[PDB]
Amino acid sequence: MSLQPLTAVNCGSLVQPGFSLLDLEGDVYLFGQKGWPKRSCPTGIFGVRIKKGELKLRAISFSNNSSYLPPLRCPAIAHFEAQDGKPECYLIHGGRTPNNELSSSLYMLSVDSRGCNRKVTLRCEEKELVGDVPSARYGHTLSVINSRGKTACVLFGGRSYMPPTERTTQNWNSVVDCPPQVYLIDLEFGCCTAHTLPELTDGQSFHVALARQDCVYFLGGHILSSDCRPSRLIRLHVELLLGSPVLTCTILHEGLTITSAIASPIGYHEYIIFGGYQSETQKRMECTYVGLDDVGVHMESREPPQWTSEISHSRTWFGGSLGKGTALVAIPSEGNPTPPEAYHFYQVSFQ
Amino acid sequence: SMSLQPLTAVNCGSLVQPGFSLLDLEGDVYLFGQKGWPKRSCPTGIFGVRIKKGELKLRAISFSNNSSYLPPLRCPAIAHFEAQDGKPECYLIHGGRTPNNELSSSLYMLSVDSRGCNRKVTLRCEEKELVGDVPSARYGHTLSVINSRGKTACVLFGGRSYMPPTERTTQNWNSVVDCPPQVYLIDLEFGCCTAHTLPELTDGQSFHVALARQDCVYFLGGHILSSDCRPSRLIRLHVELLLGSPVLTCTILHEGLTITSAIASPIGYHEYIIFGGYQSETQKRMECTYVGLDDVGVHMESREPPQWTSEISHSRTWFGGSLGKGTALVAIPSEGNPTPPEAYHFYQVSFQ
Amino acid sequence: GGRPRQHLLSLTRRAQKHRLRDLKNQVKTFAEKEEGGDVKSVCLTLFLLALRAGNEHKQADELEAMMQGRGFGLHPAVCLAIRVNTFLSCSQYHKMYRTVKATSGRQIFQPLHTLRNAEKELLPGFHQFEWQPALKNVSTSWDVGIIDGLSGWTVSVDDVPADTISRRFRYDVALVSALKDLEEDIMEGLRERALDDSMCTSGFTVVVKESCDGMGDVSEKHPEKAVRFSFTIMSISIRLEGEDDGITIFQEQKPNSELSCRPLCLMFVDESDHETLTAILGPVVAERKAMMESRLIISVGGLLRSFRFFFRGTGYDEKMVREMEGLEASGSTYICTLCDSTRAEASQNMVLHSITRSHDENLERYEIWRKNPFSESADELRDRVKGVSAKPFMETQPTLDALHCDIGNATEFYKIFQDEIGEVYQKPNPSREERRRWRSTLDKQLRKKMKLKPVMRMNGNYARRLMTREAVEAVCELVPSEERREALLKLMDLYLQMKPVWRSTCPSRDCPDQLCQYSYNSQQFADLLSSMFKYRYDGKITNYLHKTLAHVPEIVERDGSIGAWASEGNESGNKLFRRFRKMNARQSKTFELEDILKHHWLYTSKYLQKFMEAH
Amino acid sequence: GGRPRQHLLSLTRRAQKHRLRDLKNQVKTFAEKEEGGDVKSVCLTLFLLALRAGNEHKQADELEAMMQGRGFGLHPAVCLAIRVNTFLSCSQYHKMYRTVKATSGRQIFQPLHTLRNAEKELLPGFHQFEWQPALKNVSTSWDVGIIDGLSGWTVSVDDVPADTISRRFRYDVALVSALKDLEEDIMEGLRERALDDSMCTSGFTVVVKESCDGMGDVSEPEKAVRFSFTIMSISIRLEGEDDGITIFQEQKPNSELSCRPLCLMFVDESDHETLTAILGPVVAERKAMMESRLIISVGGLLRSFRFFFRGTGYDEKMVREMEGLEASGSTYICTLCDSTRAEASQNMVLHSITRSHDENLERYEIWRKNPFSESADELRDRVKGVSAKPFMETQPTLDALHCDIGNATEFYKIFQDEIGEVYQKPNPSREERRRWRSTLDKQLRKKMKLKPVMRMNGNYARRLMTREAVEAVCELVPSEERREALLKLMDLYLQMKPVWRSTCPSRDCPDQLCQYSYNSQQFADLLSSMFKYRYDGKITNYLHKTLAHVPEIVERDGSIGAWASEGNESGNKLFRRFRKMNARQSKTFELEDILKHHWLYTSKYLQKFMEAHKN
DNA sequence: GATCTGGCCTGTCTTACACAGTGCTACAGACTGGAACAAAAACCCTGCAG
DNA sequence: CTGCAGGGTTTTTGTTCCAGTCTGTAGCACTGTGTAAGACAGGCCAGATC
Ligand SMILES: [Ca+2]
Ligand SMILES: [Ca+2]
Ligand SMILES: [Ca+2]
Ligand SMILES: [Ca+2]
Ligand SMILES: [Zn+2]
Ligand SMILES: [Zn+2]
């Protein structure tokens, strides 16, 4: 439970407030480069390596069997477990593009071949969606479940721009939470269907999720309409009663209020968390350790590593997960003048 | 040959002013003349000099009770009185221009009296009156001592001055004109003063360097403002002290040299090597100049100039003095915004 | 004897009448016989012509103004014009106003509050309108004034910051402001063209030119980067009702000069970051796309009349053009902006080209890229899709620049000279310093002949004093071979022949002889290049070469001018913006640009420049 | 046939002369035969009669005022007044002018070159004069203007270089210009005092106040010094038992609009060399001027003038730097008594004024010669703190502004010490000092709403010494006794602040002056009782000043609020604003522009054209 | 199967350079006359046109 | 009667030159400011290599 500063050697002007990170087969991949890709890197996926406390970067590429991906800003990340038929992958949907339009198109990203000389190959199969498709929305969340015994996928959360009947060009950059109806995603066929329950009184954003054995638990978030930062930690239970995707849900009492989380698991189902903010002026500073089992989630607060003062009095901040109790955070670095490197990095780890 | 080293002063960047002087009293070296009237840190203005490990340090000096204090002159004249009967060892100073830009026209006999305890020095002064028929107030001249079988006196020549007091005008209050070519034979005890003319002294001038020996003196290059030129001639006077009219004669040399505001270094009794000042109004000289002299004559030949840094060969001006015995101190006006505020890098030059 | 003669202007009017009754009755009967007894006008003209005898024009002009009516007060309009036209800030006005006011007994200027009241008639938001059909996803108001640009980002911390600062109008209300201003000029076009009034209510078409440029690091002692997005009315023609392929009514006569470039949006952002730029410019794009379909109704001269639109988006420098269009930046393999050639396929064939590049097909290429329906390889996909990388967003007719239009050509002629000093086809491997030696001897040659001191980089003036048959002959003095000399003479002759064609304003009116003869001349050019100078353009070419030999005639046939769309004009208005900020600061950033835009848009209307007679 | 002849008021002047040739020559012959050959007055009287016979009397009366009375718009003088009194540039002025005339004929404003000719009337070098007796060692010229400030420094790089940029006036010419400016008011004063004019031409008396303190950071070298003076008062002495009659007394001297600049230099106030090397000529002027009698033709009569000077407005730092005393806060502090530091603590109030400028000279001679052969600090005592040579006779007074700001910062740190329980804990911590800083910072941020700066201005002080703000601050320190104590201190301070802020305390508050001694005495006994913990023997300068010396000063002088230095540091803001929007700009010329503008900005012959025609 | 260097590619200082703002000045173009004259506007007035 | 070609008519308006006279504007000297063209370094990739 400690921190250590890093050094943005170069390639620093290519990391923006929001982004994503994916752990798979060792190498961790940055996603969401500011601005459209350059000829420096066509894809946008960067490989990151770190040695002696340096933050260096390398470009990646795809096969021909692959589609090319827009650099989405705040998507939803979901880990596909490695088993039949085509393991293993990571799923993205759908965020906002460098043009403020929105995807409504999930992608199925994988690794293909290596090295030979430590090099990596990936592919990106967009999975067309039949339904009842989800409408484009961001900040939301997705998760994977394996329910007796077929595997499928579940979506929740999200804001958007108002439907294009009161889409008002003075407010043309407003947001309002989409009506909170979960969607169910089968891989193939992509039989996307909407559902809901009365317990889903209202829908939130920026809420990290967590699932295991088709019983998912939702964490702290925020809702604009009521301006609250509710504590409504939720459980929901699903199962494939083919031919019926039966669902059940229930509120639970204890729920923390932490926005823009930073999730780095360590154990089989044990997650040490940072959390971006406590209240929309005052950020969160303390850590969090979360157990969970078939009895349920159980909370605990580990030790907070000693943030330097420079982060303590920041106006904002964010971060991402480097894996295995270790992760990467960032500061909007106020310098007079700008370096223009607006982001120092401190590294965090467990024990 | 000759060599330079870039120095840096630790805790001094605002005492040294565009003009100052240097003095050696009994192997001990004293700076003179500060920018601005005496602060409380030193009510004297005289400073111990030190050069160690590339660092330039300074210290304060003190005085006695019968020792009158000295206003910080800027460009006076200097001439070592030879340590002898009765009172060694004087070092005369007069009279420069004052902070409030007047001219003191006052002879100050400066010497050392006691020591120490711990490297410590105690000085004194006697601002001597002038009986005459005294020289008027002026500055930029120079003077030296002579001995005539065996009477000893000290004589001055040269200098500029403000316009005459009648014709002086408030829109010309800062322009200056050269002094009349009249030499002043200065007795020291008593403090008598007598002016002398020289018919072959075609004009007054300023900023010349000169040295004396065994009652005969040679005057080196300075400047004349009548034509805005710099004569490269040299002059010489053969003078003695006969009772009671110290009869004096002078004559011209064929060729001297073209130097202005130079740096006078000794090595021996009368063998000197000079570091050069300025050639013309915008082009300064760069090379050394060795000068041998005797009762047969002055014998002169150049020397090898060291390799200057980029700045000094590209700066606008420079100035300095000699720490004595072939050792010297110089200065460059620096350029910087922000000011370091070290407006002056420091070099030291020597012989062999 | 008699009474001494006294001066007539000291005696009372009775004695003046006594001594002047003769001339009084003489002028009376003279006026009776000559002018019908108009005694006042005749004695006025005589007093005037006697005043001008001594060259004293001034008092005669003053009294002439005292006659034929009076102009005691000043029209408030001209007065607001005089506050703005000189950067006088508010309190400065009030001070000089009090001064002159209680100086001499008459309200010569108008005071503040009435100035501002009369002014509010000139900003956006003062002339109601319909819209046929009603607009697609557009607000309904018509008095909405200066909207903040942020466009309602919930100030929420979570997401991308909302710290960006911006102020603008709604595009439509800006357009209606400019038009309702220009009522005088459109009615002048009507009176000149001798066209009916009851039969001029529908067939209008206004061409409106967009433009956006970065503006760096506003210098203030005490908030640096800036972007300014503006438009300009270009022409309005008739379309009723027969064939009438086009009958212009009001053609702008100083197209680029910043006096006509009405600012519409301003944002303390950087030219670079695609993100926040789009995040604001969206609304503008939505309006633009949404507007071009419908038609507009407006009352002008009592008759409500119709207006359509077409948009010519031109005013951008190449970086911005790649950005909005989605192509790489910049020294890419897809060097052009209208063809698809690499360097090489422009090297083998230079001018035998065709313009095809278009917006919706760029959208198409992008979709193709994203899906990759042919699952080909990376560089395979790039080449098969013609270098499109990113979903573009704003239609821009990607026209050539007029401002530089030379500087590549300049430096190319410069290099060519430096190489014809050398012998490249004998020593095709020059070294580092020999090219410098040749450059220096060339420059000293020119310095001795044409008084052009050496340079480091090519401004305009340098090039213009360069491209002279005179400088051609002078540099020819240095090249040895009697042969290649006349060759490059032919070269530079053709280039001189073609310059004005593209820096023109209306060659269809200015000098059509070269325009009609152009294409063949460009052909001879490319022939001379490939035949006598292939040593250098085997496979690589300069950017501007593609344009200048490619489509200039095709572009003009597409439009009919080049300079009449160059944003070079907007690059002037930066001087305005910066000074305005320096002299009408509020100053808090929230209202800073508020007042900046208010005063600026005021500065840029016809209505006031018309009161800038100086006649 | 024949073309119809139109009305005479529409024809061209060539056609009008051709139409009127008959009556033109008839009027010529009539003027030549009967009126002495002057046609102009003849046609003037004829137009007068043809108007006055029509009962259109307003137009004829306006015409008759335009002739022989300067109509022609408004004025050249008022015009220049406007052009300067709101900083309008030359291009700005001409652009306003050609517009305001272009539309709306009957020009009001005047062009530039007429203001070029007008300015020659208000600068120095125009009104003739001389001295009785003639002036010693001052030029015989009187028609000179702005002089290059060096006084003609020899450029020879051997001596000190001419590194300085400076321009100034000829002090005497500046004086005579300001006096001939005040002619209007002195004539009205001779009126109001019911005094003769042709007689009493011998006992005029002028007093002159002069000050100088620059500012920092003039950039984007960097510093500056500004030496300016202002006519204070002017009285008449004739002829005997009559002690004198104050003719004019300045009604608002403390404010900007009377501070005539006289010299400006890009020097630091620190390097004591360049300062005197420039200011020398002014020294010679002052010295040689104290005696001779000045003679100007004011009000048609050349009348005698005398001069007493009163050098006052230098802030204390320079007052030392011009009195050569130890710099600056050593054991010798009182610029008016021989007192030590501690001898101002044992006794704070009972001191006599001892400092005599000429005795400073004669004691500096005692310092140098040392007739009693004393050691260093024994001699420092024997001379009582005299180190350098006095150079400028400054009248032994103090300023208002810096004194009161020193009181403000003293009470500021008295708060920052009483928030700590330091009377029990004698040695506080530096970080606890900074935290007491922060707690008093939020304290005065909560009430009275003022911000933190590292260095202080005037409003900070004037709103910083008030009683309810003290109670807003007293609400932190826990004691009940010390709060009432230092609130009694604030109250007693308000018993005395306008005593030195008084313009004439014998008017504004004689009750607070005649009891002043007892107020300072209770002050001293309180400092000895409850705050002795801080002032055992260490005191601040301004405190001694305000406590022990005020009464004798005012008793001898007439006021303190009179000779204050308010205008200087406050109007260096106007200096800055000038160099901004009126410079040339180039070093050797920045001043010769700024000075012309500044001295222009401050002449009554203009300021009246702002107030006199405001009410 | 892993390491080292030339070619080259792309973001980065940096530095010549235009150019804008301001007083000042200088010059050039509009303003004064007597005769004597084409050339045209538009009333009129004839004269060849049915 | 109409129709035009063009004769008369007086009346605009320019028209020529030399001596002044006023004024509106362009040109000049000038350093602060944005700049983007280019020197470059320094990192990376493929080529020759370990
Ligand atoms: Ca740009
Ligand atoms: Ca630009
Ligand atoms: Ca000060
Ligand atoms: Ca100050
Ligand atoms: Zn093309
Ligand atoms: Zn005292």
Sheet containing B264-266: order of strands: B264-266, B272-274, B289-292, B299-301
Count, residues in chain D:
615
Give the separation between CA D514 and CA D508, rounded to whole angstroms: 12
User: Which two tokens mark B249?
Assistant: 């004669």
Count, residues in chain A:
351
- What is the CA D77 to C1' E29 distance in angstroms? 29
Partners of A185 in the β-ladder:
A153
Q: DSSP string of D553-615? A: HHHHHS-SSSS--HHHHHHHHHHHHHHHHH----HHHHHHHHHHHHHHTT-HHHHHHHHTTT-
Give the one of A35, A61, A62 whose C-beta lies nearest to C273's C-beta.
A35
Nearest by Cα to D207 from D250, D167, D270: D250
Residue with token string 């010329």: D589
Nearest by Cα to C386 from C344, C336, C420, C427: C336
Give the separation between CA B273 and CA B262, rounded to whole angstroms: 11
> Left if phi > 0, otherwise alpha if psi is -120 to 50, otherwise beta: which for C479?
beta
Solved using: cryo-EM
User: Which two tokens mark C594?
Assistant: 């508020």
Give the one of D63, D95, D614 whose C-beta lies nearest to C63's C-beta.
D63
**Nucleotide with C1' nearest the D578 CA:** E22
- Contacting residues of B for D270, CB less than 8 Å apart: 36
**C-alpha of residue D160 to centroid of ligand 4, in Å:** 28
- Contacting residues of A for C393, CB less than 8 Å apart: 99
User: Which two tokens mark D559?
Assistant: 């006021």
Which chains contact B through at least 3 pairs of Cβ atoms less than 8 Å apart?
A: D
Q: What residue of C is the nearest CA neighbor of D43?
A: C47
Is C9–D62 a contact, with Cβ atoms under 8 angstroms apart? no
Is B170–D284 a contact, with Cβ atoms under 8 angstroms apart? yes
- What is the CA C250 to C1' E38 distance in angstroms? 40
- What is the CA A333 to C1' E12 distance in angstroms? 21
Give the separation between CA A348 and CA A274, rounded to whole angstroms: 10
A–C CB contacts, 8 A cutoff, strictly below: 115
Is C104–D74 a contact, with Cβ atoms under 8 angstroms apart? yes
CB of B176 within 8 Å of a chain D CB? The answer is yes
Q: Measured at the alpha carbon of residue C388, what is the angle toward residues C383 and C390, in degrees to the nearest 5?
A: 140
- Contacting residues of B for D330, CB less than 8 Å apart: 40
**Nucleotide with C1' nearest the A56 CA:** F43
Count, residues in chain C:
615
Give the one of D154, D158, D324 whose C-beta lies nearest to B175's C-beta.
D154
CA–CA distance from B95 to each of A36, B19, B37, D411 (Å)? 78, 14, 17, 50
Contacts of B113 (CB under 8 A, 6+ apart): B64, B122, B123, B124
3-state secondary structure of D10: helix
What's the distance, CA B47 to chain centroid? 17
Residue with token string 């109790």: A325
Amino acid at C172: D
Q: Which of residues 204-233 of D touch C (CB under 8 A)?
A: 220
Question: What is the helix (H) or strand (E) element at residue B153, kind and residue range?
Answer: strand B151-157
Q: DSSP string of B193-219? A: EEEEE-TT--S--B---EEEETTEEEE
Q: What is the DSSP letter of C254?
A: S
Contacts of C140 (CB under 8 A, 6+ apart): none
Q: Is the CB of residue C562 less than 8 Å from the CB of residue C556? A: yes
Q: CA torsion C127→C132→C138→C139, rounded to 10°?
A: 40
Q: Is the CB of residue C523 less than 8 Å from the CB of residue C474? A: no
CB of D116 within 8 Å of a chain C CB? The answer is no
Nucleic chain E contacts, Cβ below 7 Å: A 13, 38-40, 116-117; C 52-53, 55, 57, 331, 453-457, 459-462, 572, 575, 578-579; D 1-4, 13, 17, 89-92, 112-113, 116, 581-585, 592-593, 596
Give the separation between CA C549 and CA A3, rounded to whole angstroms: 61
Residue with token string 């420094």: D153
Nearest by Cα to D483 from D492, D495, D474: D474
Give the separation between CA B57 and CA B329, rounded to whole angstroms: 13
CB of C285 within 8 Å of a chain A CB? The answer is no
Given 3-state DSSP classes, what are the helix, strand and coil percentages for chain D, each rounded to the nearest 5?
50, 10, 40
User: Which two tokens mark B53?
Assistant: 């490990």
CA–CA distance from C442 to each of A305, C129, C417 (Å)? 68, 65, 8
Q: Is the CB of residue A273 less than 8 Å from the CB of residue A262? A: yes
Q: Which nucleotides of F are covered by protein (CB under 7 A)?
A: 7-15, 20-25, 29-35, 37-39, 43-45
**Nucleotide with C1' nearest the D14 CA:** F13
Q: Which nucleotides of E are covered by protein (CB under 7 A)?
A: 1-3, 10-12, 16-26, 31-33, 41-45
Give the separation between CA C292 and CA C309, rounded to whole angstroms: 6
Give the separation between CA D449 and CA D471, rounded to whole angstroms: 15
When scoring A173, A281, A315 by the number of chain C Cβ atoms within 10 A, the one with the most, hence best to mutate, is A173
When scoring C13, C14, C63, C103 by the number of chain D Cβ atoms within 10 A, the one with the most, hence best to mutate, is C103
CA of C452 vs chain D CAs: smallest distance (Å): 27
CA of B218 vs chain D CAs: smallest distance (Å): 22
Strands A150-156 vs A107-114: parallel, antiparallel or unpaired: unpaired
**Nucleotide with C1' nearest the D111 CA:** F23
Is B175–D151 a contact, with Cβ atoms under 8 angstroms apart? yes
Give the separation between CA A167 and CA C138, rounded to whole angstroms: 8
Give the separation between CA D572 and CA D579, rounded to whole angstroms: 11
Give the separation between CA D224 and CA D269, rounded to whole angstroms: 8
Strands A141-147 vs A120-126: parallel, antiparallel or unpaired: unpaired
Is D389–B40 a contact, with Cβ atoms under 8 angstroms apart? no
Give the separation between CA B175 and CA D154, rounded to whole angstroms: 5
CB of B18 within 8 Å of a chain D CB? The answer is yes
**C-alpha of residue D213 to centroid of ligand 4, in Å:** 8
- What is the CA D597 to C1' E21 distance in angstroms? 18
- Contacting residues of A for C389, CB less than 8 Å apart: 36-37, 42
**C-alpha of residue D581 to centroid of ligand 1, in Å:** 28
Is B65–D154 a contact, with Cβ atoms under 8 angstroms apart? no
Domain locations in chain A as residue ranges: 1-351
| Helix residue ranges, H only, D120-201 | 171-181, 183-192
- Contacting residues of C for A316, CB less than 8 Å apart: 157, 161
User: Which two tokens mark C123?
Assistant: 């900003």
- Closest-approaching ligand to the CA atom of D269: 3
Which chains contact A through at least 3 pairs of Cβ atoms less than 8 Å apart?
A: C
Q: Is the CB of residue B109 less than 8 Å from the CB of residue B125? A: yes
Q: Is the CB of residue B47 less than 8 Å from the CB of residue B60? A: yes
3-state secondary structure of D191: helix
Q: Measured at the alpha carbon of residue D394, what is the angle toward residues D389 and D400, in degrees to the nearest 5?
A: 130
Give the separation between CA D406 and CA C188, rounded to whole angstroms: 71
Give the separation between CA D164 and CA C463, rounded to whole angstroms: 42
**C-alpha of residue C340 to centroid of ligand 5, in Å:** 6
Q: Measured at the alpha carbon of residue B336, what is the angle toward residues B332 and B342, in degrees to the nearest 5?
A: 55
- Contacting residues of D for C25, CB less than 8 Å apart: none
Amino acid at C565: W
| Helix residue ranges, H only, D228-267 | none
Contacts of D120 (CB under 8 A, 6+ apart): D126
- Indicate contact of D with C: 3+ CB pairs under 8 A: yes
Mark D131-165 as b/e (b = at least 16 C-beta within 10 Å).
Answer: beeebebbeeebeeebbbbbbbbbebbbbbebebb
**C-alpha of residue C551 to centroid of ligand 5, in Å:** 7
User: Which two tokens mark D57?
Assistant: 């009397």
CB of D23 within 8 Å of a chain C CB? The answer is yes
Q: DSSP string of C347-397? A: HHSSS-------HHHHHHHHHHHHH-TT---HHHHHHHHTTB-S---S---
